[PDB]
Amino acid sequence: SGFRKMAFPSGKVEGCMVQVTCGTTTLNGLWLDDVVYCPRHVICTSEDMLNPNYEDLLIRKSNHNFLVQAGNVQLRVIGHSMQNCVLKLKVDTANPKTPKYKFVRIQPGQTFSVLACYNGSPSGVYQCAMRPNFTIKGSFLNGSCGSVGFNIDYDCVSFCYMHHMELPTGVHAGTDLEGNFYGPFVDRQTAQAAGTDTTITVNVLAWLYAAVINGDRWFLNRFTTTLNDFNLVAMKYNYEPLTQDHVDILGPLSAQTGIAVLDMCASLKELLQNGMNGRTILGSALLEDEFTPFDVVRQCSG
Amino acid sequence: SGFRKMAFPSGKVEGCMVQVTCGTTTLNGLWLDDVVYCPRHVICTSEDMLNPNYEDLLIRKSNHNFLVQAGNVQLRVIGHSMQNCVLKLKVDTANPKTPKYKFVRIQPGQTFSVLACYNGSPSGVYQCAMRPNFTIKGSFLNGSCGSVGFNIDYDCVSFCYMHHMELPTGVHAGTDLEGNFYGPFVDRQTAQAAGTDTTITVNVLAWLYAAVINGDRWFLNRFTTTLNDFNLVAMKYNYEPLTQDHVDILGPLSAQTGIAVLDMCASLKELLQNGMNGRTILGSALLEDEFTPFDVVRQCSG
Ligand SMILES: N#Cc1ccccc1C[C@@H](N)C(=O)N[C@H](Cc1ccc(Cl)cc1Cl)C(=O)N[C@H](CC(=O)NCCCc1cccnc1)Cc1ccc(F)cc1
Ligand SMILES: N#Cc1ccccc1C[C@@H](N)C(=O)N[C@H](Cc1ccc(Cl)cc1Cl)C(=O)N[C@H](CC(=O)NCCCc1cccnc1)Cc1ccc(F)cc1
Ligand SMILES: [Cl-]
Ligand SMILES: [Cl-]
Ligand SMILES: [Cl-]
Ligand SMILES: [Cl-]
Ligand code: NA
Ligand code: NA
């Protein structure tokens, strides 16, 4: 029993974290086989950051300009390139701790584990969702850029996020591991605003099913609703529209609990319209949207 | 910026997790050097569980009765003993992945990271506090017994919890790594009730300081209170008494934010008496008590 924000075990990613230094700029890199991946803005000075031309800055770099440290052993760089917003440094040593891995670009509403690192050294692990506005609400300090987000499936690490910057609002933006930003953001030190955010409806419903599986039932009701009438209430409360695909994804949880998806939507509708009136769900006094249906199935009983 | 429930990187503990089997009973064990540690009730059958005499059951065991698997390699047991409620199995191979480590018995209100494991294989990591009633509100399914809780300080793993059982209320009980239960519990399959729980006051205050550090200030006020008058309100809301030692521990956070501890207590008093009135603190609509002052300092900016 019980339900917790749960990260993947981080060991396989810990063995890949390194430190990349260019002059006075140091951030984290990811060492897989003989390649180190890190944010390309490591080649920027504090002056270059307002509006860099990265093609210019990179062509002016030498391999010996890059200081790569794994633990306390320096890795010699033998080649460098740029793929979108990530720098790729070829090193002369393949990482002996390289896990089985994939790079994947995720959709908003999907979750991943973040290994927050400083100077190539892991400090903590936590669970994040990609917000509908392509930011993440992370916990990051100066020096954390280059930390990665990931999922694990049967000892294969699927890397999906590399951290690039904190916005003026204190939320966080970055790329997939091929250097493409999530959202409209760019890697320059200017004030960038994210789009207006929305609540991840399919995830809230997943989490209501988690609660039922764990014995919370006080919010259920005898009513049901149609998809259309539910979405009318969803739009009013800044919730993402619920699609038929979302309904089908919630199939397994619906079947395990015996509660039709549209039955659960009537509960959510009532919770949005009336609040909780002091009660809690899975220890929360608000509706939680950073658990996917997959997260719930993974953590909850069969 | 940002504030998340944050676990320690779990890699060093992942390399120690094994599987221990006695007949039809399998749980998780911890392999450090040439010793495997696991709950002693692995030597119980489903019948023995109502009221075992463990001295009896253990003296009837042979080394070859214990099946210990690390990954897919079987470890041969060469000796066994019992220390309180933990079984100790000497194996012929020292764990090459053994980290620097300590065993520590923690106080209620302290937090630790849990590596939830099934059949010797890690599945997830999350943060827990030891409740004042010596339970933890974990996330555990059948097969998780033997999973450990831990803190990490400069590459030393301080193991503090081994999981032994879920109570009828769905909360969780276990021991330190020398086999002493936290709280009054015993390892037999009977319905055991925990004492009435209380909220960890010093931790709530730490978390209010985290919020200030992160820019949440709406709950502050110009008032202050004495320790005695605060504790009068604390008792009324089932909060632990705040001690002078708690005040002194909150010193660093108080100094960083410029907010006297007893100033912050006046905010907590007002929050207890009036609620939040729909507002949130660090994304929470209730007062959070599973972050210690140390957790806040570790995660927040200087
Ligand atoms: N994580 C992280 C992090 C956090 C703090 C310091 C450092 C780092 C890592 C570090 N690497 C990095 O992100 N630095 C970028 C600057 C930057 C570097 C490189 C690139 Cl490519 C792009 C950018 Cl924008 C950075 O300083 N952002 C600040 C961070 C900041 O002051 N928050 C205060 C929010 C306060 C707040 C809280 C709650 C509600 N409301 C407001 C915001 C900002 C300001 C002016 C800009 F014009 C652009 C961005
Ligand atoms: N984690 C975990 C876990 C969870 C589920 C299954 C298995 C395990 C691991 C496993 N190893 C283990 O804990 N099994 C013990 C039995 C046991 C084994 C060994 C020892 Cl030494 C002591 C005990 Cl008590 C176990 O089944 N407990 C159940 C678990 C249970 O039904 N919860 C339902 C709660 C429902 C609920 C939810 C919310 C609010 N209200 C109620 C509760 C219980 C029942 C009768 C007893 F008489 C004693 C304990
Ligand atoms: Cl060169
Ligand atoms: Cl680009
Ligand atoms: Cl023997
Ligand atoms: Cl005992
Ligand atoms: Na977590
Ligand atoms: Na966590």
XYZ file of C-alpha atoms and ligand atoms in Angstrom:
708
model
C 0.000 0.000 0.000
C 0.947 3.658 -0.179
C 1.674 6.057 -3.013
C 4.781 8.205 -3.345
C 6.419 10.392 -5.930
C 8.865 7.733 -7.089
C 11.982 8.125 -9.213
C 13.824 5.414 -11.122
C 16.976 4.059 -9.451
C 19.668 6.441 -10.657
C 22.814 4.259 -10.545
C 23.086 3.637 -14.279
C 23.013 7.398 -14.987
C 25.360 8.256 -12.092
C 28.103 6.270 -13.821
C 27.846 8.573 -16.861
C 28.042 12.010 -15.251
C 31.144 14.099 -15.973
C 32.250 17.720 -15.722
C 32.952 19.886 -18.798
C 34.924 23.132 -18.498
C 35.604 25.877 -21.068
C 37.639 28.659 -19.517
C 35.587 29.867 -16.553
C 32.377 28.080 -17.602
C 31.774 24.612 -16.135
C 28.666 22.454 -16.422
C 27.689 18.781 -16.393
C 28.103 16.381 -19.287
C 26.868 12.893 -20.113
C 29.539 10.301 -21.007
C 28.240 7.371 -23.088
C 30.765 5.173 -24.933
C 33.452 7.607 -26.197
C 31.223 10.709 -26.483
C 30.446 13.409 -23.917
C 27.173 15.322 -24.376
C 26.608 18.718 -22.775
C 24.865 22.058 -23.400
C 26.629 23.991 -26.128
C 26.517 27.219 -24.101
C 29.555 25.910 -22.195
C 31.557 27.547 -25.028
C 30.079 30.968 -24.187
C 31.628 33.558 -21.922
C 29.432 35.687 -19.672
C 29.664 38.340 -22.400
C 28.828 35.982 -25.288
C 25.589 34.960 -23.566
C 23.374 37.883 -24.663
C 23.304 36.811 -28.332
C 25.881 34.183 -29.278
C 26.614 32.924 -32.751
C 27.536 29.390 -31.773
C 28.893 28.402 -35.193
C 31.364 31.270 -34.768
C 32.307 30.372 -31.215
C 32.732 26.677 -31.990
C 34.935 27.136 -35.041
C 37.267 29.195 -32.805
C 37.605 26.313 -30.312
C 40.440 23.780 -30.094
C 40.077 20.272 -28.650
C 42.583 21.210 -25.936
C 40.291 24.086 -24.892
C 37.844 21.534 -23.386
C 38.602 20.240 -19.881
C 36.581 17.055 -19.244
C 36.821 15.426 -15.809
C 35.296 12.080 -14.836
C 35.705 11.881 -11.093
C 39.296 13.039 -10.752
C 40.694 11.634 -14.037
C 40.868 14.073 -16.939
C 39.527 12.755 -20.254
C 41.393 13.920 -23.342
C 39.146 15.354 -26.059
C 39.962 14.228 -29.604
C 37.046 15.736 -31.521
C 34.092 18.061 -31.078
C 30.886 18.846 -32.913
C 27.513 20.524 -32.482
C 24.098 18.900 -32.933
C 21.394 21.558 -32.422
C 21.934 22.918 -28.886
C 24.154 20.065 -27.585
C 27.927 19.919 -27.856
C 29.437 16.496 -28.590
C 33.010 15.857 -27.440
C 34.764 12.736 -28.673
C 37.090 11.375 -25.991
C 39.842 8.785 -26.319
C 38.294 6.492 -23.657
C 34.947 4.718 -23.848
C 32.967 4.877 -20.613
C 33.229 1.387 -19.042
C 30.024 2.074 -17.071
C 27.964 2.858 -20.200
C 24.472 1.342 -19.753
C 22.184 0.103 -22.461
C 20.552 3.320 -23.572
C 18.346 5.201 -26.026
C 17.694 8.883 -26.689
C 13.969 9.704 -26.840
C 12.026 12.905 -27.293
C 8.953 12.849 -25.060
C 5.499 14.529 -25.273
C 4.137 17.030 -22.746
C 2.459 15.242 -19.867
C 5.067 12.467 -19.727
C 7.189 12.106 -16.595
C 10.869 11.380 -16.081
C 13.476 11.130 -13.354
C 16.001 13.953 -12.970
C 19.491 13.334 -11.590
C 20.548 16.783 -10.378
C 24.332 17.141 -10.591
C 26.908 19.777 -9.675
C 30.475 19.710 -11.041
C 29.892 16.262 -12.514
C 28.767 14.846 -9.160
C 25.186 13.650 -8.521
C 23.429 15.337 -5.610
C 19.814 14.151 -5.774
C 17.088 12.474 -7.783
C 13.470 13.549 -8.242
C 10.413 13.020 -10.487
C 9.301 15.638 -13.046
C 6.558 15.974 -15.623
C 7.017 17.854 -18.866
C 4.419 20.611 -18.486
C 1.966 21.284 -21.346
C 3.912 24.534 -21.938
C 7.174 22.531 -22.354
C 8.771 23.714 -19.132
C 9.520 21.569 -16.133
C 9.056 22.642 -12.523
C 12.461 21.461 -11.414
C 14.726 22.019 -8.447
C 17.957 23.441 -9.876
C 20.707 25.792 -8.670
C 23.636 27.430 -10.424
C 25.900 24.722 -11.800
C 23.160 22.197 -12.538
C 22.934 22.828 -16.280
C 23.784 19.610 -18.131
C 21.893 17.420 -15.640
C 19.732 14.883 -17.481
C 16.228 13.465 -17.195
C 15.531 9.831 -17.950
C 13.268 6.804 -17.736
C 14.384 3.184 -17.292
C 12.778 0.137 -18.933
C 14.361 -3.255 -18.131
C 17.915 -1.983 -17.589
C 17.730 0.291 -20.680
C 18.070 3.994 -19.873
C 15.925 6.222 -22.112
C 17.415 9.707 -21.791
C 14.834 12.380 -22.576
C 15.933 15.714 -21.042
C 19.092 17.764 -20.638
C 18.864 20.874 -18.487
C 19.819 24.179 -20.136
C 18.423 27.157 -18.218
C 16.112 28.609 -15.607
C 13.560 31.136 -16.845
C 12.889 34.402 -14.963
C 9.818 32.736 -13.441
C 11.997 30.112 -11.775
C 10.833 27.212 -13.969
C 13.180 25.247 -16.189
C 13.794 24.641 -19.906
C 16.000 22.272 -21.835
C 16.420 19.880 -24.731
C 16.265 16.254 -25.690
C 19.662 14.570 -25.924
C 19.927 15.506 -29.595
C 19.824 19.155 -28.560
C 16.300 20.159 -29.619
C 14.593 22.361 -27.054
C 11.251 21.406 -25.691
C 9.027 24.357 -26.497
C 9.950 27.597 -28.283
C 13.003 28.420 -26.157
C 16.532 29.243 -27.327
C 19.863 29.029 -25.517
C 20.680 32.665 -24.946
C 20.596 34.698 -21.735
C 17.487 36.720 -22.474
C 14.185 36.814 -20.633
C 11.954 34.224 -22.295
C 8.345 33.613 -21.295
C 6.636 30.247 -21.411
C 3.120 29.843 -22.731
C 0.250 29.692 -20.273
C 0.244 26.311 -18.558
C -2.642 23.858 -18.139
C -3.345 20.843 -15.915
C -2.645 17.372 -17.338
C -6.128 15.849 -17.220
C -5.283 12.240 -18.066
C -2.709 12.272 -15.250
C -5.145 13.614 -12.646
C -7.512 10.783 -13.570
C -4.673 8.248 -13.334
C -3.933 9.589 -9.849
C -7.596 9.315 -8.829
C -7.376 5.650 -9.875
C -4.220 5.305 -7.767
C -6.244 6.614 -4.822
C -9.038 4.096 -5.369
C -6.490 1.287 -5.630
C -5.060 2.501 -2.309
C -8.472 2.710 -0.607
C -9.380 6.391 -1.016
C -12.980 6.389 -2.291
C -14.691 9.391 -0.670
C -14.685 11.365 -3.935
C -16.495 8.746 -6.014
C -20.114 9.269 -6.977
C -22.912 7.408 -8.707
C -22.936 9.789 -11.676
C -21.258 9.650 -15.052
C -20.704 12.183 -17.806
C -20.087 12.318 -21.508
C -16.682 13.216 -22.878
C -18.035 16.451 -24.378
C -19.713 17.703 -21.204
C -16.602 16.836 -19.208
C -14.403 18.868 -21.544
C -16.752 21.836 -21.110
C -15.862 21.813 -17.410
C -12.204 21.022 -18.168
C -11.786 24.100 -20.354
C -13.412 26.249 -17.662
C -10.796 25.159 -15.092
C -7.746 25.326 -17.411
C -7.544 21.540 -17.828
C -6.276 19.902 -21.006
C -9.049 18.417 -23.157
C -9.484 14.699 -22.563
C -9.197 12.677 -25.761
C -10.490 9.242 -26.672
C -6.853 8.137 -26.699
C -6.575 9.252 -23.059
C -9.676 7.203 -22.260
C -8.185 4.127 -23.935
C -4.863 4.574 -22.132
C -6.770 4.614 -18.822
C -8.332 1.273 -19.779
C -6.181 -0.994 -17.582
C -6.721 1.136 -14.468
C -10.442 1.398 -15.162
C -10.653 -2.387 -15.507
C -8.685 -3.079 -12.336
C -10.900 -0.833 -10.216
C -14.209 -1.445 -11.991
C -14.722 2.299 -12.453
C -15.460 3.484 -15.986
C -13.276 6.383 -17.141
C -16.312 8.611 -17.663
C -17.502 7.600 -14.196
C -14.209 8.903 -12.825
C -14.561 12.065 -14.923
C -17.810 12.780 -13.059
C -15.816 12.640 -9.822
C -13.206 15.027 -11.204
C -15.981 17.348 -12.417
C -17.468 17.385 -8.907
C -14.027 17.915 -7.347
C -13.340 20.860 -9.664
C -16.749 22.412 -8.992
C -16.814 21.950 -5.206
C -13.214 21.474 -4.104
C -12.292 18.896 -1.505
C -13.851 20.630 1.522
C -10.839 19.913 3.720
C -10.362 16.275 2.724
C -7.197 14.902 1.146
C -6.453 12.399 -1.606
C -3.282 10.312 -1.257
C -1.997 12.863 1.234
C -2.666 15.804 -1.097
C -5.054 18.706 -0.637
C -4.950 19.562 -4.355
C -5.418 17.519 -7.527
C -2.057 16.059 -8.609
C -1.155 15.822 -12.304
C 2.477 14.570 -12.419
C 1.658 10.826 -12.389
C 0.992 9.213 -15.765
C -1.216 6.142 -16.106
C 2.040 4.229 -16.585
C 3.496 5.628 -13.354
C 0.385 4.493 -11.453
C 0.419 0.963 -12.895
C 4.156 0.689 -12.219
C 3.834 1.642 -8.565
C 0.419 0.290 -7.530
C -0.715 -3.260 -6.795
C -2.133 -5.503 -9.503
C 14.980 27.809 -7.869
C 12.301 25.237 -7.145
C 11.725 22.744 -4.358
C 11.114 19.029 -4.812
C 10.921 15.935 -2.682
C 14.476 14.827 -3.412
C 16.100 11.459 -2.781
C 19.810 10.685 -2.618
C 21.314 9.116 -5.755
C 20.734 5.409 -5.214
C 23.589 3.824 -7.215
C 25.778 2.901 -4.256
C 22.890 0.998 -2.615
C 21.745 -0.613 -5.888
C 25.074 -2.440 -6.071
C 24.332 -4.116 -2.717
C 20.830 -5.477 -3.286
C 20.431 -9.263 -3.414
C 17.656 -11.837 -3.140
C 17.370 -14.264 -0.195
C 15.184 -17.375 -0.428
C 14.189 -19.923 2.241
C 11.887 -22.537 0.774
C 8.925 -20.597 -0.612
C 9.780 -17.332 1.179
C 11.874 -14.799 -0.757
C 12.754 -11.243 0.230
C 15.499 -8.680 -0.355
C 18.877 -8.661 1.346
C 21.739 -6.194 1.660
C 25.202 -7.453 0.622
C 28.102 -5.528 2.200
C 31.586 -7.101 2.154
C 30.984 -10.845 2.762
C 27.740 -10.511 4.770
C 24.124 -10.453 3.587
C 21.597 -8.726 5.871
C 17.876 -9.430 5.619
C 14.739 -9.707 7.780
C 14.862 -12.824 9.914
C 11.255 -13.718 9.058
C 12.584 -15.150 5.778
C 13.081 -18.357 7.824
C 9.348 -18.506 8.623
C 6.741 -20.432 6.691
C 3.257 -18.995 6.228
C 2.255 -21.165 9.199
C 5.172 -20.113 11.433
C 4.205 -16.452 11.034
C 1.459 -16.259 13.693
C 3.883 -16.665 16.621
C 7.366 -17.842 15.659
C 10.138 -18.783 18.029
C 13.010 -17.631 15.857
C 15.744 -19.210 17.990
C 13.991 -22.530 17.338
C 13.569 -21.958 13.621
C 17.147 -20.776 13.136
C 18.795 -23.653 14.975
C 16.912 -25.994 12.598
C 18.400 -24.258 9.530
C 21.400 -25.388 7.476
C 23.617 -23.044 5.448
C 22.535 -24.876 2.285
C 18.899 -24.031 3.107
C 19.578 -20.369 2.158
C 19.447 -19.468 -1.545
C 21.170 -16.096 -2.087
C 21.173 -14.620 -5.599
C 23.059 -11.501 -6.685
C 21.786 -10.759 -10.157
C 21.889 -14.236 -11.661
C 24.929 -15.617 -9.772
C 24.161 -17.683 -6.683
C 26.211 -16.811 -3.592
C 27.168 -19.746 -1.392
C 26.345 -19.254 2.291
C 29.063 -20.346 4.724
C 27.613 -19.114 8.016
C 24.468 -17.610 9.492
C 23.494 -15.771 12.643
C 20.757 -13.613 14.135
C 21.152 -10.094 15.536
C 17.785 -8.941 16.936
C 15.333 -9.101 14.001
C 17.937 -9.276 11.182
C 19.456 -12.451 9.788
C 23.156 -12.299 8.883
C 24.421 -14.697 6.209
C 28.161 -15.025 5.713
C 28.963 -15.628 2.046
C 32.214 -16.806 0.484
C 32.494 -13.718 -1.778
C 32.929 -10.116 -0.671
C 30.760 -7.670 -2.599
C 33.122 -5.827 -4.996
C 30.626 -2.935 -5.173
C 30.586 -2.401 -1.383
C 30.487 1.369 -0.700
C 31.893 3.162 2.286
C 29.103 2.722 4.789
C 27.807 3.039 8.345
C 24.769 1.673 10.169
C 22.878 4.378 12.088
C 19.718 4.380 14.147
C 17.780 7.581 13.491
C 15.286 9.636 15.577
C 11.655 10.269 14.621
C 11.374 13.286 12.359
C 14.534 12.441 10.403
C 14.238 11.656 6.697
C 15.881 9.040 4.507
C 15.826 7.688 0.978
C 14.147 4.334 0.327
C 15.271 2.056 -2.506
C 12.218 -0.140 -3.089
C 13.292 -3.547 -4.405
C 11.564 -6.715 -5.589
C 13.406 -10.045 -5.925
C 16.729 -8.317 -5.314
C 16.123 -5.814 -8.124
C 15.645 -2.069 -7.485
C 12.402 -0.618 -8.822
C 12.241 2.938 -7.470
C 13.574 5.491 -5.022
C 11.635 7.904 -2.813
C 11.989 10.130 0.283
C 10.488 9.152 3.663
C 10.362 10.617 7.143
C 10.303 8.485 10.260
C 6.943 9.469 11.756
C 6.751 10.457 15.448
C 4.927 7.129 16.002
C 7.895 5.222 14.457
C 6.084 4.173 11.303
C 6.876 5.350 7.818
C 4.296 6.189 5.167
C 5.977 4.177 2.457
C 5.025 2.794 -0.924
C 5.529 -0.972 -0.670
C 3.977 -4.075 -2.254
C 4.333 -7.776 -1.533
C 7.959 -8.765 -2.012
C 9.464 -5.464 -0.885
C 10.434 -6.562 2.623
C 14.209 -6.247 3.019
C 14.358 -2.965 1.076
C 16.534 -0.437 2.912
C 16.416 3.255 3.766
C 19.553 5.357 3.753
C 21.240 8.746 3.720
C 24.476 9.634 1.906
C 27.185 11.988 3.201
C 30.236 12.472 0.940
C 30.144 9.026 -0.692
C 29.473 7.290 2.668
C 26.134 5.469 2.806
C 24.477 5.628 6.241
C 21.917 2.814 6.258
C 19.124 3.515 8.733
C 16.047 1.423 7.822
C 15.225 -2.094 6.683
C 11.626 -2.802 5.736
C 9.866 -5.601 7.638
C 6.080 -5.327 7.352
C 2.973 -3.377 6.446
C 0.504 -2.752 9.264
C -3.263 -3.232 8.779
C -3.547 0.540 8.313
C -1.303 0.387 5.255
C 1.666 2.154 6.881
C 5.051 0.521 7.297
C 7.335 -0.693 10.102
C 10.890 -1.940 10.218
C 14.264 -1.930 11.919
C 17.665 -0.341 11.857
C 20.333 -2.464 10.181
C 21.184 -4.101 13.501
C 17.643 -5.463 13.613
C 16.050 -3.254 16.283
C 12.538 -2.180 15.360
C 11.631 1.441 15.335
C 8.735 1.705 17.752
C 7.078 -1.074 19.770
C 6.525 -3.466 16.857
C 7.524 -7.132 16.601
C 8.072 -9.352 13.570
C 5.051 -11.605 13.693
C 1.959 -11.644 11.482
C -0.485 -10.180 13.968
C -2.460 -6.962 13.789
C -0.340 -4.302 15.486
C -1.472 -0.715 15.978
C 0.827 2.281 15.908
C 0.530 5.079 18.429
C -1.354 8.214 17.466
C 0.764 10.269 15.087
C 1.669 13.965 15.291
C 3.028 16.568 12.860
C 6.785 17.242 12.881
C 6.834 20.920 13.844
C 10.512 21.691 13.266
C 10.172 20.256 9.748
C 7.118 22.360 8.871
C 9.084 25.443 9.921
C 12.081 24.315 7.849
C 9.735 23.982 4.869
C 8.292 27.461 5.456
C 11.889 28.730 5.301
C 12.362 26.796 2.051
C 9.332 28.660 0.697
C 10.732 32.054 1.682
C 14.069 31.168 0.090
C 12.133 30.271 -3.071
C 10.082 33.492 -3.054
C 6.851 32.409 -1.341
C 6.168 35.100 1.281
C 2.379 35.550 1.392
C 2.098 33.749 4.743
C 4.563 35.958 6.616
C 3.300 38.498 9.116
C 4.645 41.272 11.303
C 3.887 39.382 14.518
C 5.996 37.143 16.702
C 5.215 34.753 19.528
C 6.873 33.190 22.514
C 7.851 29.540 22.504
C 5.304 28.754 25.232
C 2.343 30.414 23.518
C 3.286 28.735 20.245
C 3.309 25.309 21.882
C -0.166 25.997 23.282
C -1.405 26.239 19.691
C 0.821 23.337 18.597
C -0.703 20.953 21.131
C -4.197 22.018 20.051
C -3.477 21.014 16.431
C -1.604 17.756 17.200
C 1.825 19.263 16.475
C 4.971 18.130 18.263
C 6.185 20.593 20.904
C 8.914 22.871 19.589
C 12.059 22.739 21.706
C 14.893 25.206 22.132
C 17.069 22.663 20.329
C 14.691 22.866 17.351
C 15.024 26.652 17.423
C 18.823 26.408 17.433
C 18.815 23.880 14.587
C 16.738 26.341 12.531
C 19.421 28.979 13.135
C 21.130 28.822 9.723
C 17.843 29.094 7.814
C 16.653 31.916 10.054
C 19.909 33.788 9.440
C 19.822 33.300 5.677
C 16.288 34.663 5.366
C 16.428 37.265 8.139
C 13.301 35.806 9.747
C 13.543 34.932 13.435
C 12.334 31.421 14.284
C 9.650 32.784 16.606
C 8.634 35.180 13.833
C 8.078 32.158 11.601
C 6.185 30.406 14.405
C 3.695 33.294 14.348
C 3.124 32.540 10.664
C 2.586 28.853 11.393
C 0.204 29.769 14.229
C -1.812 31.930 11.822
C -1.747 29.200 9.158
C -3.014 26.618 11.658
C -5.759 28.930 12.923
C -6.989 30.205 9.545
C -5.831 27.695 6.945
C -4.446 28.824 3.620
C -7.710 30.118 2.110
C -7.011 28.506 -1.255
C -3.371 29.559 -1.556
C -0.476 27.127 -1.884
C 3.041 26.955 -0.474
C 5.725 25.367 -2.666
C 2.967 23.741 -4.693
C 1.249 22.298 -1.611
C -2.195 23.058 -0.235
C -1.312 21.583 3.172
C 1.584 22.100 5.580
C 4.408 19.677 4.715
C 6.472 18.053 7.476
C 8.806 15.559 5.714
C 11.664 18.024 5.042
C 14.217 18.452 7.824
C 16.193 21.668 8.238
C 19.110 19.707 6.775
C 17.065 18.677 3.728
C 16.162 22.333 3.091
C 19.749 23.588 3.393
C 20.964 20.755 1.158
C 18.512 21.543 -1.622
C 18.054 25.326 -1.438
C 20.344 28.151 -2.537
C 22.891 29.685 -0.184
N 18.642 25.907 -13.251
C 19.162 26.840 -12.827
C 19.845 28.048 -12.289
C 19.236 28.819 -11.303
C 19.882 29.947 -10.805
C 21.134 30.286 -11.303
C 21.736 29.508 -12.294
C 21.092 28.375 -12.794
C 21.715 27.504 -13.855
C 22.303 28.347 -14.966
N 23.027 27.537 -15.961
C 21.204 29.187 -15.565
O 20.097 28.700 -15.814
N 21.436 30.479 -15.807
C 20.390 31.336 -16.371
C 20.996 32.278 -17.384
C 21.214 31.544 -18.681
C 22.416 30.883 -18.917
C 22.595 30.196 -20.115
C 21.581 30.169 -21.073
Cl 21.769 29.337 -22.576
C 20.390 30.827 -20.838
C 20.211 31.503 -19.650
Cl 18.702 32.292 -19.413
C 19.801 32.187 -15.294
O 20.525 32.738 -14.526
N 18.484 32.356 -15.210
C 17.911 33.238 -14.184
C 17.645 32.478 -12.918
C 17.001 33.369 -11.900
O 17.497 34.470 -11.639
N 15.897 32.956 -11.278
C 15.222 33.784 -10.284
C 13.776 33.370 -10.220
C 13.189 33.923 -8.959
C 11.736 33.562 -8.847
C 11.321 32.496 -8.054
C 9.961 32.199 -7.971
C 9.039 32.969 -8.679
N 9.458 34.012 -9.450
C 10.784 34.304 -9.533
C 16.646 33.881 -14.710
C 16.967 34.765 -15.886
C 17.187 36.130 -15.704
C 17.486 36.953 -16.788
C 17.571 36.413 -18.067
F 17.866 37.200 -19.131
C 17.353 35.054 -18.250
C 17.053 34.233 -17.168
N 5.111 -3.606 2.620
C 4.324 -4.371 2.280
C 3.314 -5.374 1.846
C 2.043 -4.964 1.452
C 1.104 -5.908 1.046
C 1.453 -7.254 1.040
C 2.730 -7.654 1.439
C 3.674 -6.710 1.845
C 5.066 -7.104 2.272
C 5.025 -8.290 3.210
N 6.371 -8.780 3.554
C 4.198 -7.921 4.416
O 4.337 -6.826 4.969
N 3.293 -8.790 4.870
C 2.455 -8.465 6.026
C 2.296 -9.687 6.899
C 3.533 -9.867 7.738
C 4.596 -10.628 7.261
C 5.741 -10.772 8.042
C 5.823 -10.159 9.294
Cl 7.220 -10.323 10.298
C 4.766 -9.406 9.767
C 3.635 -9.261 8.990
Cl 2.360 -8.302 9.630
C 1.085 -8.086 5.566
O 0.544 -8.751 4.740
N 0.460 -7.036 6.093
C -0.908 -6.700 5.678
C -0.894 -5.782 4.491
C -2.291 -5.391 4.116
O -3.158 -6.259 3.972
N -2.580 -4.104 3.933
C -3.924 -3.663 3.574
C -4.094 -2.235 4.019
C -5.290 -1.670 3.319
C -5.527 -0.248 3.739
C -5.106 0.814 2.944
C -5.353 2.121 3.367
C -6.015 2.345 4.574
N -6.424 1.296 5.341
C -6.184 0.021 4.931
C -1.656 -6.079 6.838
C -1.795 -7.076 7.956
C -2.944 -7.858 8.068
C -3.078 -8.785 9.099
C -2.056 -8.940 10.030
F -2.169 -9.842 11.037
C -0.910 -8.164 9.921
C -0.778 -7.237 8.892
Cl 43.012 20.399 -31.159
Cl 19.200 25.540 -33.172
Cl 25.565 -26.236 6.420
Cl 14.008 -9.174 19.565
Na 11.129 11.222 -6.053
Na 11.874 11.550 -4.342
